[PDB]
Design a protein around this ligand. Structure first.
Ligand code: ADP
Ligand code: ADP
Ligand code: MG
Ligand code: MG
Lengths: 339, 336
């Protein structure tokens, strides 16, 4: 559309606040298309103008980076493209198929938003107020939630999953799948990697495998990112590829929490440096894993449905990464930056 | 006891100064001499007292006006006045020194119950948390100083400080004491398992320069909780999960982990645990005080460390005491 109105467009949708959807609200779409449209055509412009508003809030030295604009360029196009629809008849086959088509386009378009934003923060002209952290947590939680919305539509309308959501998800399988992927990268690089051990303790069901209502891709993302960190730490901390300590996983289901602990003997980190580990600016790796966003982003994924991710180390010994999730669908509610 | 009518003026004076934290080596440095101690204590002690007493009144009218609280305050006033008498006595004089240690002893015995007394004061019932952390941190610090002079000036240790402190040894002593209380209450308690990974040299017992009683107390407090949580979570006395200890020594940190299979606590409640107002046991054996965790964490912070609890609901909990491994980094931390 007319792209001069864009200022006016954000000032308007920015006046609205995000409306979090519960898992039951997400799950109950079998609801209908005109439901996913009617609501998406107002909700996404609201979500996109809110976070673009925070994008001209960036430091004039990162804002001017090329990569930064690129991604801004994507968002101005992805608000207009959905505004083309704010008047169309939710009742004809093509308004509906045109929307899904638009959505396909926006999701493919933003698939490199992080490696790109990551190039706007790498290439950036030093160090005192890296207020790049605050925005990026917010920028990336908003991004996950928009990709949530889009994928659900695009999947539901284009195991037995309702969108990207699996109602009976085997934590263990996700963990194994994510171990396999991570390990493949390790071996292709160091030609060595620790083994894997899985443990379960179902407090709610003393003998039944732990399953849950969740989005496997999100879990895979967390577990993968963490496994990569743990195999690196392990490898870099030993000498003999024949005696590398296995990575141990512990799955605990309680009445309120679903807890996953990834323990390694990767040498640990001083208590002094544990908050650092989440710095978008911090990475102990030979630059371009080694783009230091693996940890803040994974936590943003845990916090997205009322979870969290915390790391506890013992210098000289190893480290404990724990993922905390809500056990009950009833508690899994969408988390977003202030709205 | 100076006349207590000058009390308002004395606080405002020494409250104008700031505490000066000593390094672990400055403590060790007293083998300088007593006269140095006396001359530094008679300035430092009033400074730290008047500083924390001036915040005692920053308390809410509700809790300050509690007899337990007002009773503690009366103690501090008297201690301040007791010390103040040595402000113009001859340091080079034999009597003045042995009179000072005579006075510190009186103060130390008089404050011996400040915590359970404060506690009965809280019982008379939440920023309270902010005050209490600082109050109790300052108090551990004032007890540090008093104990150094009394023990040093009147067997390898330099006061309460052991230069070759065996972490496992303290861990054992704390497990046994705690263990004793439990059995006498539940008549069942976990066993204990200890492991160490001396990263810095690989097969030697981890030792450190530290205050054995401080480490003891932290480990003592934590052991009770884990053995309790474990008893409370299980139904069989012949199959009770042992408590596991990990001692890790690295270039910067000295790490002690106490892992228990006591069924743990939801993530929503972890902050609570360090609340002076929080306890899962009665107001009263083994538990009920509800300050075992916050103070223990205060002991850890004192010489620049920390105490952190991590749980997995349904399984168990990890309690970790972090210290500095190097004496060069251990300087006492203190409230204003
Ligand atoms: N299990 C671990 N043990 C020791 N250090 C770790 C571990 N997890 C991550 N770290 C540290 O935190 C840094 C940043 O983590 P991450 O987000 O995965 O970034 P990246 O892998 O791109 O460096 C790593 O470079 C590493 O030094
Ligand atoms: N290892 C543990 N497992 C589960 N809960 C614990 C553990 N540690 C402490 N807690 C909880 O935190 C509360 C407060 O801890 P604490 O300071 O020791 O107080 P108190 O023992 O007087 O209740 C306990 O009542 C208990 O419910
Ligand atoms: Mg990484
Ligand atoms: Mg206790």
């Amino acid at each position: 559309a007319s792209l001069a109105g864009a200022p006016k467009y954000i000032e308007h949708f920015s006046k609205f606040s995000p409306s979090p959807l519960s898992m039951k609200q997400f799950l109950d779409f079998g609801a209908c298309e005109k439901t996913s449209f009617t609501f998406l055509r107002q909700e996404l412009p609201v979500r996109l103008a809110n976070i673009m508003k925070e994008i001209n809030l960036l430091p004039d030295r990162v804002l001017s980076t090329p990569s930064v604009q690129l991604v801004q360029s994507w968002y101005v196009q992805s608000l207009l493209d959905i505004m083309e629809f704010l008047d169309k008849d939710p009742e004809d086959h093509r308004t509906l198929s045109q929307f899904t088509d638009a959505l396909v386009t926006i999701r493919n378009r933003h698939n490199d938003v992080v490696p790109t934003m990551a190039q706007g923060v790498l290439e950036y002209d030093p160090v005192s107020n890296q207020n790049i952290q605050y925005f990026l947590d917010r920028f990336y939680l908003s991004r996950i939630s928009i990709r949530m919305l889009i994928n659900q539509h695009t999947l539901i309308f284009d195991p037995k999953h309702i969108g990207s959501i699996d109602p009976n998800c085997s934590v263990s399988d996700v963990v194994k799948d994510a171990y396999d992927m991570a390990k493949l990268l390790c071996d292709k690089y160091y030609m060595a990697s620790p083994d894997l051990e899985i443990q379960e303790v179902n407090a709610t069901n003393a003998t039944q495998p732990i399953h849950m209502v969740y989005v496997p891709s999100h879990l895979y993302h967390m577990l993968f990112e963490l496994f990569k960190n743990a195999m690196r730490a392990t490898v870099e901390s030993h000498e003999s590829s024949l005696t590398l300590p296995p990575i141990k996983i512990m799955v605990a289901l309680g009445e309120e929490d679903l807890s996953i602990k990834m323990s390694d003997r990767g040498g640990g980190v001083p208590l002094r440096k544990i908050e650092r580990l989440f710095s978008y600016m911090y990475s102990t790796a030979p630059t371009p894993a080694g783009f230091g966003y693996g940890l803040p982003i994974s936590r943003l994924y845990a916090k997205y449905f009322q979870g969290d991710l915390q790391l506890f180390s013992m210098e000289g010994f190893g480290t404990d990464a724990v993922i905390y999730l809500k056990a009950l669908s009833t508690d899994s509610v969408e988390r977003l930056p202030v709205y």
